[PDB]
Structure 1
Amino acid sequence: RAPAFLSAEEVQDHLRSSSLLIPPLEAALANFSKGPDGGVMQPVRTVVPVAKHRGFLGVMPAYSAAEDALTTKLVTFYEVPSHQASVLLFDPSNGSLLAVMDGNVITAKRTAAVSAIATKLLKPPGSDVLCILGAGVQAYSHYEIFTEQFSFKEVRMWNRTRENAEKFASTVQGDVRVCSSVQEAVTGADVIITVTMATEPILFGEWVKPGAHINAVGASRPDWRELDDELMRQAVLYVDSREAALKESGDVLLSGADIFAELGEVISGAKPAHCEKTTVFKSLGMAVEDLVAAKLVYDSWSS
């Protein structure tokens, strides 16, 4: 019995709303951070660079006992969407390949879903203003769930090329104030989302409102950065994975910042959410997050 293939449109049908992903992801992150008592086996992501094409192949395997599912997501990103992904789903009991599915929409919706979880815990009292840095796939996915989950009075956006932000602004529903600089976009912003593939810092702490929350999603490479030192050093730093951040996050590696806690620890109440101080959630993506989503799809697909 050959494995089933699930198209991008097959997946989204059996995926449904991005915020429906939230409670299972909350469980996955907590289980992960619980370590040996959490049932999650997840080594740090293996990345092989394709220098000849300025690209990378990410391989993210995971087993999760609670979901009893065995997965591997393979993602290529190059500096045809920039990010291409496929998820493999195995029978954890015998090991046969069950399904090969398009991983792009899972990646987009799950990443947005995790940022929202961290945002819900860490956004300051009186979070009226949201700012989005970037205008790619993740920006759309984050915009959809953040306007769904939260109630911002104003949304700002900056992109490297202003045309794509204005395009973004006119495509999405609801008003978007396109700003020509990051300084303008984040000034007075209570929640900031950085979803660019920049490699040198675009976000400087001096522009950041005291107590603001930052979701740093991009710069998933040891030599890449989105944030400067002042922000990385002065803010309370949360990550999805401590082992992954110390190996793959240039924002963490180069700044020399102390990781305060893993987001899963907070979810379980093992660590506090300092919503009143300036916070940074540095997200690098974890295989267990993909696991949960792909498991939801196949199970739906099977019924």
Structure 2
Amino acid sequence: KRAPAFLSAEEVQDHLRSSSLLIPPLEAALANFSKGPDGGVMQPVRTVVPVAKHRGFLGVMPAYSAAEDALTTKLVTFYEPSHQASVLLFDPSNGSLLAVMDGNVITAKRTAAVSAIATKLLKPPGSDVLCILGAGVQAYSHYEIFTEQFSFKEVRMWNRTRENAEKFASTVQGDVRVCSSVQEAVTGADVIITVTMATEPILFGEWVKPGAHINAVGASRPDWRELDDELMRQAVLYVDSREAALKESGDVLLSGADIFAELGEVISGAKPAHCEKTTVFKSLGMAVEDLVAAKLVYDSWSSG
């Protein structure tokens, strides 16, 4: 038995600079995962252990991928540096723990990448306007990859605290139009990203342009929601994992919306991408996404 490598957030960052290297293996993983028993992924739905005394939670997210031949576990905490994560990478041939690495950078990057994959498939024709609700870590990681991958004529932002949206707009490279309400930000928007910690709906279907695509990334708890019933039930609903969406997403559970497809099914050709219709991609994240990122990082680090 020997000690694992430790890779800091900076070291992870140094080995995850290129979305063109992250997107392809994510697409493959989503597809393989959605094949279920016809693929090679073993991923139990995330386990959450409450830490009631301190208003905290520990998420446990193991996965094995036969196709990548990779074995990982992400451990994530949230306390009401509030979000923290670590990823463990094992030698799949003998179980040895090879690496413990920061999970924060990975969470930022793989989440944004999965949203970008969904948007490539689901954005309507004439997607000129992007709208981001929220101004935190995920707002930044999404903005980064979306402006790399796509060309929008306008990017808009609303945030609960306007000052933080204005800081965002000052910090990032391109022009961001800070809006005074959600309604203003989303009216006329073709692609929407919701990356907030809202617990009750902030985005109402009445305001959404027919055909818009929404990446619904927040409200990551079964009692929490970012979207109203009109939007959840009017939109064609795509998810990352059916099992996770029906356990963890308040938007899905409380609206009672039918799930049309997993993103992986669209990628593999099993289900259609109805980009012309108003679409919601409800994202929860899942262990195999962390596995893909951790493997990329580890392979890059270990090869020099």
| In structure 1, distance between residues paired with 2:131 and 2:246 | 27
SS of the equivalent of 1:254 reads helix
1:211 offset after TM fit, Å?
0.5
Runs (4+) of structure 1 exceeding 4 A deviation are: none
1:48 offset after TM fit, Å?
1.5
Q: Percent identity?
A: 100
CA contact (8 A) 1:18 1:110 kept: no
TM-score (ref. length: structure 1): 0.98
CA-based RMSD: 0.8
1:73 offset after TM fit, Å?
0.3
Give CA deviations for 1:228-282 in whole Å, capped at 9, x if unaligned.
1000011000000001111111000000000000000000110000011000000
1:50 offset after TM fit, Å?
2.1
| In structure 2, distance between residues paired with 1:68 and 1:252 | 32
| In structure 1, distance between residues paired with 2:282 and 2:242 | 10
Give CA deviations for 1:104-158 in whole Å, capped at 9, x if unaligned.
1111000000000000000000000000000000000000000000000000000
1:77 offset after TM fit, Å?
1.6
CA contact (8 A) 1:19 1:113 kept: no
| In structure 2, distance between residues paired with 1:38 and 1:16 | 29
1:291 offset after TM fit, Å?
0.2
Name the count of aligned residue pairs: 302
CA contact (8 A) 1:19 1:149 kept: no
1:49 offset after TM fit, Å?
2.0
Instruction: Report the more deviating stretch, 48-57 or 267-276.
Output: 48-57
| Structure 2 gap segments, 5+ residues each | none
| In structure 2, distance between residues paired with 1:53 and 1:19 | 40
SS of the equivalent of 1:277 reads coil
1:183 offset after TM fit, Å?
0.2
1:38 offset after TM fit, Å?
1.3
| In structure 2, distance between residues paired with 1:24 and 1:160 | 35
SS of the equivalent of 1:284 reads coil
CA contact (8 A) 1:56 1:78 kept: yes
CA contact (8 A) 1:19 1:145 kept: no
1:12 offset after TM fit, Å?
1.1
1:78 offset after TM fit, Å?
2.4
| In structure 2, distance between residues paired with 1:178 and 1:57 | 34
| In structure 2, distance between residues paired with 1:159 and 1:53 | 27
1:55 offset after TM fit, Å?
2.2
**1:156-175 to 2 correspondence within 5 Å?**
156-175=156-175
1:15 offset after TM fit, Å?
1.6
| Structure 1 gap segments, 5+ residues each | none
CA contact (8 A) 1:158 1:182 kept: yes
Give CA deviations for 1:10-30 in whole Å, capped at 9, x if unaligned.
111112223421001000000
Give CA deviations for 1:187-240 in whole Å, capped at 9, x if unaligned.
000000000011111111000000100000011111010001000011000000
| Alignment-derived partner of residue 59 in structure 2 | 58
| In structure 2, distance between residues paired with 1:183 and 1:82 | 29
| Alignment-derived partner of residue 38 in structure 1 | 39
| Alignment-derived partner of residue 240 in structure 1 | 240
1:53 offset after TM fit, Å?
2.5
